[PDB]
Design a binder for this molecule. Sequence first.
Ligand SMILES: Nc1ncnc2c1ncn2[C@@H]1O[C@H](CSCC[C@H](N)C(=O)O)[C@@H](O)[C@H]1O
Length: 371
Amino acid sequence: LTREAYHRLTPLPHPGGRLFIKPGARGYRDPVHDLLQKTVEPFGERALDLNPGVGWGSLPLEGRMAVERLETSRAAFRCLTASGLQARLALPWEAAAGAYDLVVLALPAGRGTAYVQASLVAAARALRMGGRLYLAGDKNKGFERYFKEARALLGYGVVVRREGPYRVALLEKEKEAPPLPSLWRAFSARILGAEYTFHHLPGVFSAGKVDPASLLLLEALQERLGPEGVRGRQVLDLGAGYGALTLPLARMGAEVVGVEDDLASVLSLQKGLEANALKAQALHSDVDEALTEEARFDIIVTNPPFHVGGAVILDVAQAFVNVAAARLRPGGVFFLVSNPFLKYEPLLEEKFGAFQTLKVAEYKVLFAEKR
Ligand SMILES: Nc1ncnc2c1ncn2[C@@H]1O[C@H](CSCC[C@H](N)C(=O)O)[C@@H](O)[C@H]1O
């Protein structure tokens, strides 16, 4: 995709209306969300969708109920807003307590047990007594385990739709919801001779330790540029996460801008910067969406997202490369780290003209220079 194509919102038809989607937004052609859309029916007057993506799963409620939507992904909120669907940039556990008759939750299984648990308790807290929860998931991705927990939190629950491994259940709140679990975690790490304490909420990439690929990028970068090679330089960190690259680069004296699509990760980065007395811009952004048109950088770094077990580079990750080439000043440099068999080489050759391989073992670090 071109950068314009990556950022473009496209409306797709459904009976009676339209829904905007875009590359990089969850909830489109997803069997879990599709099964929800075929299942959900109004109950009471006020609904909350805790993981809406582009908003397909709970769409049948729109115009029959008041529907609120809490979403962490910037890309998804762009779509919801374009679709005219009320939505807030919000963590699931920011939901108002006892204010809803119906909650809809496509299980965020990809973000892990702690994130799912926090979402389940948020659901239980959001509901009034006697309110109901639609819970959708995948038997291959913890549905039975999470459905059992939902039943324990709420009361009576039953599967109301099934297709292959995919399930939707309906549950009733029959008991008081517990307090939110503890959400924040911290860990220390020594990187390039300096001590850092990272802080993060559930669901982030590489919770609890610095990812070895990220460490490798930093090692390649300091070897190439020197310990002073980053001072006073403008750096963009594409997909900043809780700041494994952002914090050390800020420490080394770079003026760093982190862009990150996931709200929980942006908040994590912000807490880490504060805790380590470091300053950087921690932007909630779909790739470079939050930047001015004119913004350019001296150095761009990235450990792009990847699909677990997948052989194909994600649209978002392809866009990171395209945006990197476009956002570098002449003579600016790009560092990217990935699993060794992801086909980044032809992409860098296309966008930069040439590239180098600075490291290759458990991961590869690729390098390019703007001409
Ligand atoms: N559309 C998008 N725009 C910006 N960041 C995105 C994105 N899609 C995924 N990401 C982020 O890309 C990151 C890739 S994982 C790398 C995290 C961090 N830089 C580290 O090295 O530890 C995740 O934090 C993920 O949420």
